């Protein structure tokens, strides 16, 4: 938040006081930025699963919002994602492995996480 900005200014002033310089200069700003970043620690538990889920949600909600017409199905979603990846996979083995992975991820999202809804024909 803005409190971090004020803390950065205070740390810059502290660095200037330490080095007895008469003005705050970019070296002190860089040092305060470095220290404040190093103090922050990231939570460790996953990123790929979240990214895939977010992309799927974005696609489905764009489909819902853009059209009052009918929507797509699970197979259509899988085919669309594979078509988008087409330029990123070079061989059939990686393609089939990623297809299995995305199918399992979609099953987990629909059944376990309840994020996505499934309907019959």
């Amino acid at each position: 938040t803005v409190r971090q900005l004020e803390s950065m200014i205070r740390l810059s002033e502290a660095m200037a006081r330490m080095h007895c310089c008469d003005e705050v200069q970019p070296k002190h700003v860089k040092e305060a930025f470095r220290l404040l970043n190093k103090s922050i620690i990231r939570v460790e538990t996953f990123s790929e699963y979240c990214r895939i889920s977010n992309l799927i949600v974005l696609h489905l909600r764009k489909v819902e919002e853009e059209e009052d017409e009918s929507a797509l199905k699970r197979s259509e979603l899988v085919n669309w994602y594979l078509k988008e990846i087409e330029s990123e996979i070079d061989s059939e083995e990686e393609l089939i492995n990623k297809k299995r992975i995305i199918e399992k991820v979609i099953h987990r999202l629909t059944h376990y996480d309840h994020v996505l809804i499934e309907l019959t024909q």
């Binding site: 819902e64 059209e67 009052d68 017409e69 929507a71 809804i117 309907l119 019959t120």
Partner: protein, 48 residues
């Protein structure tokens, strides 16, 4: 699964129940959240 509101109205009026009761029941289910509208309000679907 999805059901059209017209189908429910026809089914219950053939049973000769009033339409206002069906509307109120649908509104209460909407409040509870079991029933949701599709992109067009003609057809509803069931959640939990």
């Amino acid at each position: 699964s999805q059901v059209s509101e017209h189908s429910i109205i026809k089914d219950f009026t053939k049973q000769k129940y009033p339409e206002h009761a069906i509307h109120k029941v649908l509104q209460l289910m909407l409040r509870r959240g079991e029933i949701q509208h599709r992109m067009q309000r003609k057809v509803l679907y069931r959640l939990k």
